[PDB]
Ligand SMILES: [Cl-]
C-alpha cells in the first residue's frame with residue numbers, strides 16, 4: 001504494498017495524486033502526519049499529538065529572505081538541512097510526477113500568530129548549467145488557484161534578475177505548471193509593451209525570461225511577426241489592453257515587492 005494516499009498537515013487533510021517513496025512501513029498506515037513546521041512524517045495520530053506539543057519550530061529552518069505583511073519566503077540549503085529538504089521532497093512527490101544537497105529550497109508561507117505556515121515551495125540548482133532557475137515548483141492542493149503559484153514563479157525570476165541571468169523552469173511542467181507560466185509570462189510582457197521600441201533580447205534582459213519563452217508567449221498572444229528568419233515585435237496597444245482584461249492574463253492577486261526582497265547573489 002500500500003502507498004501513502006492521505007496526509008494530515010496542520011489543519012488540512014490531503015489525498016495523494018502520485019506515488020511518493022516513503023518507507024514501506026509508512027505507506028501501509030491509513031493516514032500520514034507531519035509537522036507543518038519541521039515536516040517530520042509520522043504513522044499515528046497519537047505520535048502526531050505528542051510531537052505537536054513538543055516541536056519548538058514555528059517556521060521553516062532557513063533564512064527568511066523575503067517579508068511583506070503576512071507573506072514570508074525562506075531560503076533553505078540542501079547541505080545545511082538535509083532531513084527537512086528530504087521530507088519536503090517526499091511531500092512534494094505526492095503531488096508531482098517530475099540527494100537534496102545540490103539544491104536550494106524556497107518556502108512560501110503565510111504567517112499568523114501561531115507561525116509561518118507552508119503554502120508552497122520551489123527548488124533550484126545552486127548553479128544550473130542549462131540555466132534552470134526552477135527545478136521543482138508546487139502549490140499545495142488546498143492553496144492552488146489563489147495566486148500562490150504565480151507568486152512562486154514571480155519570485156524565481158526576481159532571483160534571476162538579481163543574478164544577472166535569464167532562467168527557465170526545468171521540464172516537464174504539470175498541467176497547472178503550464179497554465180501558471182503562460183499567465184505570468186503574458187502579464188509581464190504585456191505590461192512592458194503597454195508603456196515602452198524594444199527587441200526580444202531587450203525584453204529578456206528586463207525580465208530574466210528566456211527569449212524562446214518570450215517568443216512563444218508573444219507568439220501565443222499573436223504579437224510577433226516573422227521576417228526573414230527573425231522574430232519581430234508587432235503589437236497594437238489596443239490588443240495589448242484587450243488581453244490584460246482576460247482572466248487568463250489578469251494581474252495576479254499577490255505580487256513580489258522587490259523592495260521587500262533582501263537577497264544576495
Ligand atoms: Cl484533497
Ligand SMILES: [Cl-]
Pocket residue numbers: 144145146147148149150151180
Ligand atoms: Cl497561481
Ligand SMILES: [Zn+2]
Pocket residue numbers: 035037038039040051055056057
Ligand atoms: Zn516538528
